[PDB]
Amino acid sequence: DKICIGYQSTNSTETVDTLTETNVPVTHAKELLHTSHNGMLCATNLGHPLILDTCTIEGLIYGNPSCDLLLGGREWSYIVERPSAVNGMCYPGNVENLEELRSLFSSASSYQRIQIFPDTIWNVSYSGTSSACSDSFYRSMRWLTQKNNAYPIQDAQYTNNRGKSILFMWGINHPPTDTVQTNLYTRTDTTTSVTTEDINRTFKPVIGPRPLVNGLHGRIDYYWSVLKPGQTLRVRSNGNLIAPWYGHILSGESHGRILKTDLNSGNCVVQCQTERGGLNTTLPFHNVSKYAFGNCPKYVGVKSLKLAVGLRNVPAR
Amino acid sequence: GLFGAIAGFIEGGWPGLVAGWYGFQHSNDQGVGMAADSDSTQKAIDKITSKVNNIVDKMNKQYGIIDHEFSEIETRLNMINNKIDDQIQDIWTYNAELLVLLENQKTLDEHDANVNNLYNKVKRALGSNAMEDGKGCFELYHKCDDQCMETIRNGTYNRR
Numbered sequence: 379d380k381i382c383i384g385y386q387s388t389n390s391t392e393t394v395d396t397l398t399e400t401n402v403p404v405t406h407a408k409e410l411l412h413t414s415h416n417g418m419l420c421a422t423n424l425g426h427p428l429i430l431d432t433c434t435i436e437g438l439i440y441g442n443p444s445c446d447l448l449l450g451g452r453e454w455s456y457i458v459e460r461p462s463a464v465n466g467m468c469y470p471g472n473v474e475n476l477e478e479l480r481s482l483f484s485s486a487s488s489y490q491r492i493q494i495f496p497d498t499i500w501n502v503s504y505s506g507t508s509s510a511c512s513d514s515f516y517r518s519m520r521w522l523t524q525k526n527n528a529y530p531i532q533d534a535q536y537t538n539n540r541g542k543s544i545l546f547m548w549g550i551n552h553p554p555t556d557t558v559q560t561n562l563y564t565r566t567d568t569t570t571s572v573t574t575e576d577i578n579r580t581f582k583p584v585i586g587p588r589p590l591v592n593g594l595h596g597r598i599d600y601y602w603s604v605l606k607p608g609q610t611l612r613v614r615s616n617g618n619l620i621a622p623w624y625g626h627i628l629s630g631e632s633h634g635r636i637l638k639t640d641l642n643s644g645n646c647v648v649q650c651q652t653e654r655g656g657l658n659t660t661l662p663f664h665n666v667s668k669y670a671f672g673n674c675p676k677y678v679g680v681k682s683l684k685l686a687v688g689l690r691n692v693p694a695r
Numbered sequence: 696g697l698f699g700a701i702a703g704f705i706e707g708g709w710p711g712l713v714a715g716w717y718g719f720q721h722s723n724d725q726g727v728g729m730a731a732d733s734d735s736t737q738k739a740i741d742k743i744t745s746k747v748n749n750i751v752d753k754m755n756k757q758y759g760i761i762d763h764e765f766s767e768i769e770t771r772l773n774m775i776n777n778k779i780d781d782q783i784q785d786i787w788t789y790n791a792e793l794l795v796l797l798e799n800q801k802t803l804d805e806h807d808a809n810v811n812n813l814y815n816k817v818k819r820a821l822g823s824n825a826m827e828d829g830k831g832c833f834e835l836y837h838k839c840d841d842q843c844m845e846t847i848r849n850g851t852y853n854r855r
């Protein structure tokens with residue numbers, strides 16, 4: 379008669395690694411790394427993403443005439459700029475501090491337009507347009523030009539009483555010739571100033587032909603700033619100014635991401651979203667992407683993190 | 696291994712032990728049979744279940760990396776940002792991998808010790824009423840029927 383102490387053995391093919399040995403057979407193990415995603419762009423706990431398929435963020439902000447669908451304002455969890463989004467600044471020119479602008483914008487979770495300067499306040503023409511801009515112009519600004527061969531000094535003011543910051547835009551036109559400069563502003567030497575209690579910016583035109591872009595030799599330098607609650611914006615110009623028309627009230631905080639992909643979007647909701655797809659899991663890690671955002675596990679760059687649960691699996695035979 | 700029982704002096708496992716990790720196999724006139732030891736098995740299950748939960752709880756916190764845009768003249772800022780991201784990733788990946796490798800060793804050794812402790816507990820109870828065959832069994836010097844066997848398993852063996 380005898381009594382023996384022993385331990386379990388199974389047909390498990392699970393293995394785990396240790397520092398002093400690898401591929402140790404174990405009776406039970408738990409994979410801690412989640413490696414699957416749904417291959418789609420979905421909504422997160424913060425809502426649906428703002429998917430821009432024809433307009434770039436700055437195109438929307440400046441109101442490129444091809445982005446009218448966005449005029450009513452939106453709210454988002456995150457932003458997606460499809461590679462097809464090519465409508466940004468239709469009229470040749472650059473946006474100063476573009477990265478900061480796009481960052482500031484994407485960080486909010488919504489925008490709502492607000493009129494700063496009504497068309498009536500001007501004593502000069504305000505409906506200038508361009509073929510580079512669908513024979514129209516930006517919905518955020520007005521291309522001021524002479525009326526009746528006169529361009530009196532323009533001096534307008536707007537006080538932010540919305541109790542919320544207003545993102546506003548403006549530009550300075552640089553005609554390709556002195557003739558065009560005069561035909562539009564009545565003078566070759568102008569001065570434009572955009573000011574508030576904090577900023578004090580002034581601009582002067584520099585006539586001359588730049589390389590062709592969208593068929594034009596001229597340019598418009600684009601600028602932006604933020605009128606804080608209570609502050610007063612004031613613009614004075616005797617020519618060359620592309621006046622603020624509508625601004626945006628930014629609110630909330632989103633995931634603050636800008637994904638640049640053509641990944642398919644679907645009618646879905648996930649805890650964690652990445653540019654490759656989303657996922658749901660209770661496992662502590664994942665290897666889908668370091669850019670994951672939302673309610674996520676910790677990203678780790680490996681194929682597996684198998685934790686031993688049972689004991690070393692030793693075959694009797 | 697560290698405690699010398701599993702894949703040690705008790706050379707192999709038992710495919711017949713279906714209820715738990717550790718158990719007993721007896722041999723008397725009435726036949727042979729094995730069953731898991733509930734006490735030791737349940738205690739081990741709670742321990743490892745806790746370790747898993749604490750690991751999951753301690754390591755499931757995400758870190759955020761935003762793919763910021765940089766201008767042509769922000770190449771230095773761009774590199775500094777990449778450095779941060781790369782090290783955040785390398786450090787956490789290292790912590791994750793090492794925690795698992797190191798804990799896996801401890802888990803395996805703990806199962807080994809639990810077997811070793813069960814064996815020594817029985818050795819003590821039996822006293823000189825049995826001899827070790829050196830393979831995990833105790834050759835009893837007296838006949839021991841199922842009821843006797845049960846006293847050994849439930850720790851009430853008389854003549855300890």
Ligand SMILES: *[C@@H]1O[C@H](CO[C@@H]2O[C@H](CO)[C@@H](O)[C@H](O)[C@H]2NC(C)=O)[C@@H](O[C@@H]2O[C@H](CO)[C@@H](O)[C@H](O)[C@H]2NC(C)=O)[C@H](O)[C@H]1NC(C)=O
Nearest residue numbers: 416421422423424425646647648649650656657658659673
């Ligand atoms: C991924 O999870 C989505 C919601 O996230 C979380 O899901 C768990 C379920 O395990 C739930 O208990 C949490 O409350 C929830 N966390 C949040 C977001 O607060 C799932 O989305 C759900 O989809 C159904 C289907 O119509 C909808 O009715 C629910 O409202 C919605 N959940 C929420 C709260 O948005 C989603 O189905 C799941 N994805 C997968 C792979 O199934």
Ligand SMILES: CC(=O)N[C@H]1[C@H]([C@H](O)[C@H](O)CO)O[C@@](O[C@@H]2[C@@H](O)[C@H](O)O[C@H](CO)[C@@H]2O)(C(=O)O)C[C@@H]1O
Nearest residue numbers: 506507508509510521523553554558562593594596
């Ligand atoms: C507000 C205004 O006058 N807008 C004009 C525009 C500007 O005067 C011009 O861009 C200033 O540099 O000019 C438009 O027409 C242009 C022609 O005058 C030019 O000969 O060719 C251009 C293309 O190469 C362009 O067609 C314009 O930009 O569309 C007409 C617009 O109303």
Ligand SMILES: *[C@@H]1O[C@H](CO)[C@@H](O[C@@H]2O[C@H](CO)[C@@H](O)[C@H](O)[C@H]2NC(C)=O)[C@H](O)[C@H]1NC(C)=O
Nearest residue numbers: 498499500501502530531532533534535613615
């Ligand atoms: C357009 O012209 C009108 C009138 O010439 C300007 O409005 C007047 O502005 C002065 C000085 O700011 C005030 O004292 C008057 O009370 C205003 N009265 C009128 C007629 O509105 C207006 O400011 C000009 N537009 C701009 C912004 O240049």
Ligand SMILES: *[C@@H]1O[C@H](CO)[C@@H](O[C@@H]2O[C@H](CO)[C@@H](O)[C@H](O)[C@H]2NC(C)=O)[C@H](O)[C@H]1NC(C)=O
Nearest residue numbers: 411412413414664665666667679680681682683
């Ligand atoms: C994340 O983990 C997976 C699985 O460990 C990695 O490996 C690929 O996984 C798929 C599906 O399980 C297999 O069919 C492939 O053979 C695996 N590829 C190889 C050989 O590495 C996957 O690569 C990981 N993802 C990332 C982005 O690293």
Ligand SMILES: *[C@@H]1O[C@H](CO)[C@@H](O[C@@H]2O[C@H](CO)[C@@H](O)[C@H](O)[C@H]2NC(C)=O)[C@H](O)[C@H]1NC(C)=O
Nearest residue numbers: 841842843844845846847848849850851852853
């Ligand atoms: C350990 O097993 C023994 C043997 O089965 C148990 O002893 C019996 O206990 C019952 C009480 O229900 C008595 O009626 C019997 O006479 C006992 N048999 C003998 C000969 O010992 C013992 O109770 C068990 N102990 C534990 C901790 O469960």
Ligand SMILES: *[C@@H]1O[C@H](CO)[C@@H](O)[C@H](O)[C@H]1NC(C)=O
Nearest residue numbers: 387388389390695710711713
């Ligand atoms: C375990 O695997 C062996 C070999 O493949 C096989 O003979 C046996 O039937 C399996 N036992 C179970 C639990 O199915």
